[PDB]
Design a protein around this ligand. Structure first.
Ligand SMILES: [K+]
Ligand SMILES: [K+]
Ligand SMILES: [K+]
Ligand SMILES: [K+]
Lengths: 276, 276, 276, 276
């Protein structure tokens, strides 16, 4: 099936007048480990602009200033602070780990803190280098509400499929190995969304998106969507994926390359349009 | 009674041609203690944009750079610098303490410095976590010109009323326990302004405001209003509260969520309109 | 005499096609000493936007990041670096010392470095707290091309005149004590420009300018003007002073307060208009 | 021959729909050594905005925050980190070394790391102070795809020609001393592009460009062009040079000075127009 605007218009519902906060969810982002700070800033920017009720960032000490230059709306702390990181996991509804996390000792220590602190009611998004980190180890998943957002090569690491042999049928079968509800966002030329026996295709998107930080922005948007829209999780993530490229398509008419932060700036205006 | 634009148009008076500075007041903001830096940046942004003559921020050493990235208009120093903090209290007309202050040892040391340095002619706004700090201790108030801006839960801590039993009559009676002139801004779904036997209701506002940092922006605006408008303090704070949501209402027509910093950017253009 | 647009249109000449750089001058700014960093950032912003060929800032180590967040166009270094500060003085055509300099030991050490390194062909602008620093000491001036930009109170310190007795005749007579070519910019409600027996009045300006950082922006603009326009120095500084308030007047139609950084952003568009 | 829009329209081709990333190249920038941080930020800004697929910056530790304030899209690390700098050279298609590099011990250590790590398939741009660094030493070039972007004075250092005797014929003959494919961009009043027996002249450009950071922006643009357009390297660099001044010409109609960062902001909109 094809993910289009009508699906996205189905998900992006006008906000209930009464319910204020909580309803719109709390996300914790974990990443931007040296030297990949910008990645967590771009996911943060996307997440806030998508309408997450509260956004909290666990990042490198020396990257907090730059984050706040862009986004004072998001609390940020040193990810090495083990007890605060723990407290913040329990306060979060959605945990996005991976953008700019890297693979050093601090990343593995952190991965393992998060992995032991995740609760069953929480949504866990595993992005970028955290896919490699998930691959090195294994048996019980701390939640069933798992979203994977790997690159062509990172998904290879997790599933054992080379880029030529990452055909729909092969990716689909490698998924039946993770919990049934697991959503996979196969970031690619044409990104596809997998869950169980469902495959979603986006027709929107173009070469103006082939620029550094595009995936981080996508990760942030998916996190913001799942935080506030509690209906079918596959369609919610699918909508996030559609809108990301749909905005890029709009910005392309007047831009040779569409920059990740330029897409983030446009998010609410377009979500507003999508809500009618 | 209902706080509307006509009241706000009554407060926001065209500026006297002669009187330059001083008239528009000096505010000291104290907060943005690690890791809640963004909060003091958002209150600062609101305070300057509301037209405070001079804005000074006592904040965490490592948060000054980020503040100045947004706002070189505001002097900022390390709140641990006891003698400078003291000097700055005596130079201020309005002291806004609390947004991002936190509750650690540095926050309590600071609370107590401010509390002993406040003078009777000064307006004191106690926000966020400083409400909890005020709650732990008590007998003489250093000023009668007190404004409280607590969340549903923080006001519980101060008054002993649960969120179900924070009914108008109960909040009103719990106020008769603080000095007669004390203004309470009950930040809520529908924020209400209390002083003595007066209750102000705003009809403006919506769910697009249910995003992190919204209260900090409100605290900054109230501080900027009270700094420059010296008529009835209840109506001045009420106007600040109205305009905050009124701007959010305007920005909502083209935004699914209205971000705290987006509201700040619009303040003077709208105050200009309000002044006619 | 009155400083108006016709004078400003006389100074702001269309740029010669051939002459590229050098012609437009090199300014060194010295200030933004802790905790007054924003001041040097606002003077820097004004100076670059006014069209200075090259702008260099000697500032506090911990303030360079914030400066570059606003203005990567300007080189910045630690003012404690004595040998680099010296080298940079000799490379500069115009030295603006004072905005946010403060009065501590580092400020006095620096004042005295600059004072001994100034050359006769250089223009020296002494601003803010550097007026107090000039007041404490005295006999030979390192240049005759001196511009003073003090506040009502700072000029008192230098001349011995109280704010009531800073009447035109008294200020004029206190100037005949500094070298003949010295220009005084008496920043006030209505700023006036003094040199010898000349007094310039600006009619433009309003109460929307009574906000923190307004003087720093003026200091930066004067520095940028004198760097590139080598005709009569009194009229050049006068034009800078006029345009500062003229821009504020334009921005006031849609702004209750006009912020110093908002004026800086508009400078070249308006200078372009002034050049015809 | 004259470099105009028709040449630039020939180079800036609409992006292939399929090919996503890699095609658009990876650039490593090395510079922004203390205190010339802004220079690498301005080259970075230009490089990303020109459409480089991935941009990585090797810069001073204390300059990474400021870079990310402007550009979270670009990874940045401490250039003193020898093993990471090495790894990043091998991952890059284009290496731009020099803007703000300075000439101290750290710059020479770095120059020599890069010089030994460059591979034959890589394009190497030597800018600003790195021209002086290239001049001090000499015999085998690590690549034939060399672009030199020196100032009037830096090219003197390399070739032994004074500014009066840097006549077309003299510059042309001094080039026959570097590998045959070497491109020289003679940044000047009227910048000219040299390769072999070819000389390109731009007619666009004006005095509004005579402002600090203009060359850094040019260096960044050339880097972004060569990263994505793999046809004739002389024409590709020529186009980059044309567009830089062409944009400045457009911005000049409403700007007395055209600032380097203002040009960068406009790049994709204009490249989009150039692609038709
Ligand atoms: K809808
Ligand atoms: K009015
Ligand atoms: K003119
Ligand atoms: K074309």
């Amino acid at each position: 099936m094809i993910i289009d605007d009508l699906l996205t218009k189905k998900i992006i519902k006008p906000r209930p007048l009464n319910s204020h906060k909580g309803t719109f969810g709390r996300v914790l982002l974990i990443g931007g480990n040296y030297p990949y700070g910008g990645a967590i800033i771009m996911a943060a920017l996307a997440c806030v602009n998508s309408g997450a009720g509260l956004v909290t960032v666990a990042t490198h000490k020396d990257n907090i200033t730059a984050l706040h230059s862009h986004l004072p709306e998001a609390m940020a702390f040193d990810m090495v602070e083990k007890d605060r990181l723990s407290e913040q996991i329990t306060a979060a509804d959605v945990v996005l780990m991976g953008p700019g996390l890297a693979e050093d000792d601090l990343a593995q220590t952190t991965f393992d803190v998060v992995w032991q602190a995740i609760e069953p009611k929480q949504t866990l998004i595993i992005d970028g280098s955290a896919i490699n980190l998930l691959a090195k180890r294994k048996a019980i998943w701390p939640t069933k509400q798992i979203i994977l957002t790997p690159h062509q090569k990172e998904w290879e690491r997790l599933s054992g499929l080379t880029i030529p042999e990452q055909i729909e049928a092969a990716t689909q079968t490698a998924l039946a190995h993770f919990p049934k509800e697991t959503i996979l966002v196969a970031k690619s030329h044409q990104t596809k969304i997998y869950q169980g026996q469902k495959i979603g295709h986006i027709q929107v998107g173009g070469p103006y998106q082939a620029t550094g930080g595009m995936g981080d922005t996508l990760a942030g948007m998916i996190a913001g969507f799942v935080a506030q829209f509690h209906t079918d999780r596959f369609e919610v993530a699918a909508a996030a994926v559609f809108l990301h490229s749909y905005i890029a398509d709009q910005l392309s008419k007047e831009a040779y390359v569409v920059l990740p932060t330029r897409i983030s700036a446009e998010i609410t205006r377009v979500m507003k349009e999508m809500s009618e």
